[PDB]
Amino acid sequence: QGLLAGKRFLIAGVASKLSIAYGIAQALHREGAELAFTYPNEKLKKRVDEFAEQFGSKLVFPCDVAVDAEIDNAFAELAKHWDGVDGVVHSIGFAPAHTLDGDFTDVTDRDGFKIAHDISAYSFVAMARAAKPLLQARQGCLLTLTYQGSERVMPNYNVMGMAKASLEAGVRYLASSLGVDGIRVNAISAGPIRTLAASGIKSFRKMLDANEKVAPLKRNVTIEEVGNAALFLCSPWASGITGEILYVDAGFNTVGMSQS
Amino acid sequence: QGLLAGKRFLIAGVASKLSIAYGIAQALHREGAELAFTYPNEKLKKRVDEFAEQFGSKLVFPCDVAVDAEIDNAFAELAKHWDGVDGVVHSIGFAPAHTLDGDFTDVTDRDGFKIAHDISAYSFVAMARAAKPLLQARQGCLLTLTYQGSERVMPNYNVMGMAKASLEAGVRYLASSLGVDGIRVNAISAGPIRTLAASGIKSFRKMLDANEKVAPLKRNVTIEEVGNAALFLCSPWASGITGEILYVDAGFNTVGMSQS
Amino acid sequence: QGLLAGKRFLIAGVASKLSIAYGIAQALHREGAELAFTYPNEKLKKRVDEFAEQFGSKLVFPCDVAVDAEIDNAFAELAKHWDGVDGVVHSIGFAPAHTLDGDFTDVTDRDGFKIAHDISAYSFVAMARAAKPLLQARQGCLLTLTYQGSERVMPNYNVMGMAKASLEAGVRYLASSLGVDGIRVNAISAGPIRTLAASGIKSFRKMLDANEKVAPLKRNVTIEEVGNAALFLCSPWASGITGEILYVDAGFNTVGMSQS
Amino acid sequence: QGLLAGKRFLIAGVASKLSIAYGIAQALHREGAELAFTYPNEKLKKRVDEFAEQFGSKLVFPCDVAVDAEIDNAFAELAKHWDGVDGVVHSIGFAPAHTLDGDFTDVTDRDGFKIAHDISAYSFVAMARAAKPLLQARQGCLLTLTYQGSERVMPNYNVMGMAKASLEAGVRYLASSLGVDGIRVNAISAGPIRTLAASGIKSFRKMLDANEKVAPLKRNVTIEEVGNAALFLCSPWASGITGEILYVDAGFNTVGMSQS
Ligand SMILES: NC(=O)c1ccc[n+]([C@@H]2O[C@H](COP(=O)([O-])OP(=O)(O)OC[C@H]3O[C@@H](n4cnc5c(N)ncnc54)[C@H](O)[C@@H]3O)[C@@H](O)[C@H]2O)c1
Ligand SMILES: NC(=O)c1ccc[n+]([C@@H]2O[C@H](COP(=O)([O-])OP(=O)(O)OC[C@H]3O[C@@H](n4cnc5c(N)ncnc54)[C@H](O)[C@@H]3O)[C@@H](O)[C@H]2O)c1
Ligand SMILES: NC(=O)c1ccc[n+]([C@@H]2O[C@H](COP(=O)([O-])OP(=O)(O)OC[C@H]3O[C@@H](n4cnc5c(N)ncnc54)[C@H](O)[C@@H]3O)[C@@H](O)[C@H]2O)c1
Ligand SMILES: NC(=O)c1ccc[n+]([C@@H]2O[C@H](COP(=O)([O-])OP(=O)(O)OC[C@H]3O[C@@H](n4cnc5c(N)ncnc54)[C@H](O)[C@@H]3O)[C@@H](O)[C@H]2O)c1
Ligand code: NA
Ligand code: NA
Ligand code: NA
Ligand code: NA
């Protein structure tokens, strides 16, 4: 019997086998959890159905986080199956491509800013509100994924740094709001990982190489390591932890300047 | 001859004599600066004309930061008078009243989130872009006002904490973008001060009293103290400082728990 | 088979059943670890022998961290039994009583400062160096215990805040030094817990009550929660994490001001 | 009449014209302050007498901060001339050369640790206590110099990172202790500057070059910029600021990864 035997988690953000959300699903399922999944649009439905089947789940629901009604409906549909949930994993972020490529001052337009914040930060708050009744029933938790571009300037990131800073403050405000219900709210700040987000981004290889040289462990992290940290934060072993941004970046954030 | 003799600053955010922006204007003008001002809507025009006259200025322009064209036009109009600017002070923030009163998870709706971030965070980026040519001409600086609800949960603040976290990351991304031009970008994180924002907010008195008990100096800060810190950050004496969030809160942020 | 089956850990800092180190021992042993223990002086030997027996261990060695030779000898003796170690837990701190009671400026004498730093911060570095060969053999990890008085002023703490800040920087420098060997180095920043340290300290009850009111979870943490977080950081599930200060304080650190 | 006309400051840490303390002295004197100086040992006396004369001062006293009696005596001697002081500047740090050159775990011995902390951190606390009566008389302030190796790993720094972390916590504890008297306590975290400390350190040039590439302003800071920031923090314009670590590093600390 695994650490999460008898427990239930909703996973939002699987896109491919490289997704952080996929690695999190694998780890939770490995420890005995039953899973449910959302997909962002109809074009992704069949792929997400396939991924869910890999984890023995047929609980798959549409959820475009741009749309209030879809968030509400995803949780209403989930509630037909589950009378309570042990956790909700938010592994969702987006900014228009143009905002991430070029000089910050020049390229950060209002709509680009709006979208980055709406999809990457507000959506976690909206999902927390929609999930609240199911979370209350089992004193379940919330988890999101952030990146240290929130706290220091990182390359090719621009307005996403603003949106992740917003998200991390959201983690804290949610933790204070929902803590009275026994609901913990945390984030993982992952080091860079090749996922669908990096596809066609020529500079990603160079950034990974630079990360590998700076990180104290002298290597890049994996979705398995992020997945295991997520497993921990979603488990009874993390019952004393809320409002926390846990860095899973092989120590990169702790270095100010590396030798060479 | 004052520290800012021959220098020029645009001040966005005067609403009343209690405004942080008013205290900043007073300090810059005291040290010899020539000033220009924006007003948010027609109802505020005559009041802002009056305030500007107090500082010997007739350079007063409309600028609703919700509107791209108005931001652009304010700087085009300013450029008819000034061929360069030594600094731009952004003292602008807003969230709908309902978002600041009640449980964070329950009250933080999408539009409330959007407005808080658009007006309180994005607007600084937009103003920086519009101001860039005038700032380049004199290697001028940018300054904004933030609050420590970005970093820790503060009462009656909710989504504004997310928006200020976004703003502070914006300070850093702007500093990296504009630093090559010699343009510094900083913020002051002010302790709580009674301004128009607190009018009719019953709990504000209690929060000020609590601040006064916790702060190492055992008193609340004033717009004169914030104004003098702004003067410093807008002056040649701060030429080595960029991307900085300077706390002017009588040390409040440094205390984890106070005796009694 | 537990998560730590076949693994070996040295635990320094058991004093009583209330000790943080005792809770950590319980959790590691629960998951299958074999344990070894140190004791600070002869008066504690029999008690530590008894505690070790509770965890099926007869590996008990003297180690007063004030004495270079004792640190070296403890690891030389351990190496007669173990050809490698999966982790070393440092749960050791001390400052003279007079330094923790009264006005910081008045009571912080040179010797009090020296002792606080020597025992609470330097000792972790010394133990890391002495443990290095055994840690290298299994790519084992290091863990220490810190308190958030390092980052913000906490009551009845004084020079211990300086010593914990030193310790946390030590975590980072150790992580960068030992990371090349695959050795991770982390800390837990625990919320306040009643242990032997609080015995006879009249104000401790009031501080716990205040913690309970501020913390988002509205309760105080336990050595079981700290123990489980330690288990995580000492396990393969934390392989992506080094140089990290993980807060296990029920979210206390995330709150700037609480309602009432 | 300068900003500091009629005000008095004690400067501890002048060694050569490159010293940070020398740049601070220049700025305070430029704005009308009367100055006093300490020297560490007899070999430095004549040089410090000469520097003091450059600022129109004959108030020069021995003060080896390793020795309790010398700290006390320096302030007793100063009090024969001054019935109150507006500020005390601590620009003193040291670690044995061997501790700063090589692998942190290998080279950080107990005595090296002890000295680094005693001279670089404890001495500020001791000087604050000795200065308290003179500071109380004018509600004067305290200022120290720190480096961001406290918060992130910086090269060729090792135990000094621990000692600066200790010092910065000391700033906070002092601010809480002395704030009731109206005494502010702050630090400047300076970017790297060539001073006597770098003489014969071959790698310093490379570290400066790396700093210059990363910093948002794309240049290194000077003692004039540090001096002007110190002037600010020692002036009435900073009356709202205590417990603060002000970064004067051309924005270096705000960057996580630079392009190339
Ligand atoms: N990969 C990294 O290096 C890295 C580092 C730190 C944090 N993160 C964060 O991890 C999370 C997962 O990203 P990933 O790297 O796994 O990439 P990914 O593309 O696999 O996952 C991103 C997910 O966001 C979903 N999404 C985007 N817009 C949406 C919408 N409107 N409605 C619903 N879902 C929507 C996508 O469909 C996709 O499933 C993101 O928040 C990302 O910022 C990634
Ligand atoms: N007063 C405090 O306790 C405190 C503490 C820290 C930071 N701040 C920040 O200081 C800044 C000034 O606030 P204040 O306290 O002086 O209150 P205020 O009401 O005097 O100033 C707020 C300004 O924002 C302007 N504004 C709002 N929406 C706008 C729009 N669409 N277009 C243009 N201008 C718009 C208002 O017109 C007003 O001039 C804000 O960013 C606020 O968050 C205030
Ligand atoms: N209890 C709390 O609220 C709390 C909160 C955060 C961190 N901490 C830290 O947790 C750690 C454990 O403390 P605890 O609360 O379990 O109390 P404790 O008294 O049970 O453990 C303290 C240990 O330090 C050991 N120690 C002291 N001087 C020593 C020396 N010279 N040589 C060897 N060992 C020595 C003591 O013998 C004892 O075993 C300490 O670092 C403490 O600062 C405690
Ligand atoms: N130069 C840098 O890059 C840099 C960066 C950040 C902070 N700092 C800090 O600035 C401060 C000044 O250093 P600097 O770079 O001007 O070098 P410096 O050598 O000019 O000044 C160091 C001072 O410390 C004094 N000192 C050392 N041991 C002493 C003792 N026992 N008693 C009395 N005085 C003693 C020295 O005599 C000297 O006056 C130090 O705290 C240093 O850590 C320097
Ligand atoms: Na960019
Ligand atoms: Na609230
Ligand atoms: Na005290
Ligand atoms: Na080193």
Oligomer: homotetramer
Helix/strand/pairing class of chain A, anyone?
alpha/beta
Head-to-tail CA distance between termini of chain A: 48 Å
Largest interface: A-B, 42 and 42 residues
Radius of gyration of chain A: 18 Å
- The percentage helix of chain A is 40-55%
Named at the architecture level, the CATH assignment of chain A is 3-Layer(aba) Sandwich
List bound small molecules.
nicotinamide-adenine-dinucleotide, sodium ion
The total count of strands of chain A amounts to: 7
* Strand order in the largest sheet of chain A: 3-2-1-4-5-6-7
Kindly report the name of the CATH homologous superfamily of chain A: NAD(P)-binding Rossmann-like Domain
Indicate the proportion of strand residues of chain A: 5-15%
What name is given to the CATH topology of chain A?
Rossmann fold
Shape call of chain A: globular
Number of domains as seen in the coordinates of chain A: 1
PDB class: oxidoreductase
Keywords: ssgcid, NADH-dependent enoyl-ACP reductase, NAD, Structural Genomics, Seattle Structural Genomics Center for Infectious Disease, oxidoreductase
Assembly: tetrameric
Entry title: Structure of a NADH-dependent enoyl-ACP reductase from Acinetobacter baumannii in complex with NAD
